[PDB]
Amino acid sequence: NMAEVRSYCYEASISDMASDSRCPTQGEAYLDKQSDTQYVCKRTLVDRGWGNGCGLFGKGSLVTCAKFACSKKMTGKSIQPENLEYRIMLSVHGSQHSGMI
């Protein structure tokens, strides 16, 4: 009857991968699920120009996100003195032909 303190996730799987990108001078990209918890996001720049569909050249702005989900967890419990229940076996000499007990 010990209780949990901190549970780590050693196997996780992502889903709902989505990205948003805007050409330079159009500010910064944004996604609806980027503020949602259980999501992983990152904003960076990519090469952008007329060949991609644009009016200017330079670094664009894109953010990608994926829905975090754990598959296998590991849990760390606390050992509190409330339950330790040591058992000490006793065996006296003078009898008892054979065995431990």
Place this chain on the structure above:
Amino acid sequence: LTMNNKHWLVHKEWFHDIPLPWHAGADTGTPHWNNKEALVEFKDAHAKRQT
């Protein structure tokens, strides 16, 4: 510590700094994970289409 079905004892100062996703209590259904970026690597080289 219990991970798959096997169990160990662990110095807490070592257990507190494991670089992995984690949550504090005992959320059963939908936990709010901390540092989800520990497992999700983002390779993004300047060309295009960060992975």
Place this chain on the structure above:
Amino acid sequence: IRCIGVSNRDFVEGMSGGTWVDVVLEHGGCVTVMAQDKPTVDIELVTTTVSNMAEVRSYCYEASISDMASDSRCPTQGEAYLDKQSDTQYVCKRTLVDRGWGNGCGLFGKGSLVTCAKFACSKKMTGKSIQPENLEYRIMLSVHGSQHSGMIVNDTGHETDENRAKVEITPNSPRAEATLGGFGSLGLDCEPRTGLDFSDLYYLTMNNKHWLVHKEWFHDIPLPWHAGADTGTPHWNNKEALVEFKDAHAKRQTVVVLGSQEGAVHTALAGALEAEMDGAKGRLSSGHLKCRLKMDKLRLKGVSYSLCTAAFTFTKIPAETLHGTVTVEVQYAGTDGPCKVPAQMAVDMQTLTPVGRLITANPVITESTENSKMMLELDPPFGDSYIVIGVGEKKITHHWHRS
């Protein structure tokens, strides 16, 4: 055109009177080659597809144990033995355990115990040898003097027209002659598999995640493995690296598996080259191909052309590229037939004197239809300047200040 919306763009100039222009192509990196009187070409190493390889070693990272059995004899009686020791699918171990009047015998001491268990793999990885004989580099060319991609609606588009062709470079066929047509033929005697991709590399496949690993780093991966020949129920070697049985308090040893080992090796190849893409052909994400460019039998398209007369009109706003060059796209709006586009940078307007450099050598209009667009690139001078194209009557100026 091509090679304008990228940062890793390398400009090189060709020697006057020389036909060799050596250059290096790399993944995600572009090259713009120019000469004094020869057309400007944009070459790029697009893909490095390796395929049709044979497996060398296959390591197991997810193993499952089964059929735990044991046999033991008391200290004075001798060493223990189990029939599964001779089986190629079982891992065993001999250890010493306490024995005496308590358990089953009549002498105190350490008896011998053998513990066997049936090994089996759940998830494994396979590394293959990529012999120099089977891998295909792909190089794309694009000559200047076109709008975006005419009549060919894609960017790669096709190999059926001028300004666009793909040259496949592979060792045992390194030299290649690109038949541009009209512009001539661009020769390229590349240097494949020596610029990079030395024989230390194996193509490793694990859980659809692929990489390229060094020579001996893959040999001594501490995992159970089998050699390069696949049959049903394979024979695993060094299974003890994933199945450990070390001592307990006494009276018996316990056998436990090492769990999974996927993410353990995910971090083991940090910085190693990656070849994620698939489709039955390993598409690399790195290149360092050295090439030689032969400018012998290529010629400028617009040399026998007369200058265009019906002055232009801008289509898009002139943009500054990442390296400082200027780009403009204009619709000529005159059925002069095939004519040479007059392009020039003018610091003033008194006399249209050459002030800077022109990337697109002699821009030319293509068809004889009424309205046709074309794109050209210029190299402006540092500071204030202007942009004027067309004949003196109905000139079009655009103020341009670079750096």
Place this chain on the structure above:
Amino acid sequence: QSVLTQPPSLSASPGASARLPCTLSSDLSVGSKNMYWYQQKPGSAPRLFLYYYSDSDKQLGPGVPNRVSGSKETSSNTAFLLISGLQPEDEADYYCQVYDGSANDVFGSGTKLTVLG
């Protein structure tokens, strides 16, 4: 909610500039929405016509010309499909499309643009 709306029929004489609006629902901000326009000839598998987000963030169909322009009026959130050089072959059904918060495709009713004669 999250439904697009636009009139069943529009027509204009050949040569003039035809503006095909696309009114988004009240829960959307058109200024930050990538607008997608589809063109469908009567029985030939509608093709992607014009994607527009800004006058510097735009991309047309593979062969459609610059006569087709786009614009946004953020006062009442409504995209536009502008066709300047109206030829008789511009007579088709045009659709618009956006995406919701969960990235589900939201198409519009669309206008059956008819070139008069």
Place this chain on the structure above:
Amino acid sequence: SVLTQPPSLSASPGASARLPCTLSSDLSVGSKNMYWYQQKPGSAPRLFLYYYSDSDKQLGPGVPNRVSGSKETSSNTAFLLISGLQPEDEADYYCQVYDGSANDVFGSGTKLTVL
């Protein structure tokens, strides 16, 4: 364990004839030594071409260099390519390997017919 072969083949004189030989699902074509025999009725099958890779291959006695070999490990099939079809080569071809216990497995017999 058995190897599949195509029964019918037709090609124009001067073209490149492709003769496939698909190994079973229990075998990997990339790691097997392929052997190709040629047989016409009334004659014992002569050994035509051995192929394992483009750097490990041996032709038969008096066989022109227009007889090559190739492998596609994606579909797990070995090839027998004959460019410049001459009339003397029209016969039935076989492929053969040796499995774990060194048992020879042949094919169905490719009836090559040059038009």
Place this chain on the structure above:
Amino acid sequence: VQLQESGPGLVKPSETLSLTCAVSGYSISSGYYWGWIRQPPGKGLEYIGYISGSSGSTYYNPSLKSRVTISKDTSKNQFSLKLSSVTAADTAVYYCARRDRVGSYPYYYGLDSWGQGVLVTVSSAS
């Protein structure tokens, strides 16, 4: 990437409907969400759902939530759609289309390449 649609001519109501889509020019499992969009007689376009190319996750329509099931198989480079418990109003012209989900160019976030399309009615026999 020229997709061709193939499917039965007619299905009776309350009966499983299956459409098969061959992409024929692009390898699936590289990405590029593949979906199915319909136009019942002459009305607007209604979408049903799309399946992820690489991962294989399926995203469906809120109204067509419990009836459809989209499948994928990259061995022969095809993906299919299964419409169960069809109704008389489900007669439509279906198109399996392409779409990009993670790219840096928003033009491909729309349905770039479309299929030929099949027509299916839900009437009785004759």
Place this chain on the structure above:
Amino acid sequence: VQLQESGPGLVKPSETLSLTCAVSGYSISSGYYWGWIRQPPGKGLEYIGYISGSSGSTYYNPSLKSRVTISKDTSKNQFSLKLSSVTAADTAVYYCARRDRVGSYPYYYGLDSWGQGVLVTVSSA
């Protein structure tokens, strides 16, 4: 490296059938593997086995578990084959062949030298 195969034309059902070939131009006690491969006209090739010139080892078709027994005579330089208790469906044309398995430049692993062929049928009338 001539290989000369010869034998009877007809063997009756449920009888031990035997054929033999002489290696006319190469000594058997040198290492090469000498074997038999049969096939009915129009049917694919099927190997019967091979015998060693050095040790005498024999390994046959898995289908013919105890049916075949490849014999040998090293001194006279001949090697035989004794298919015991033949069946009616064993009608085929048999071939004598020589191969190698001891690592001589893998091309030689396949049967490079063949015989001429002996037509054998199992009938009663």
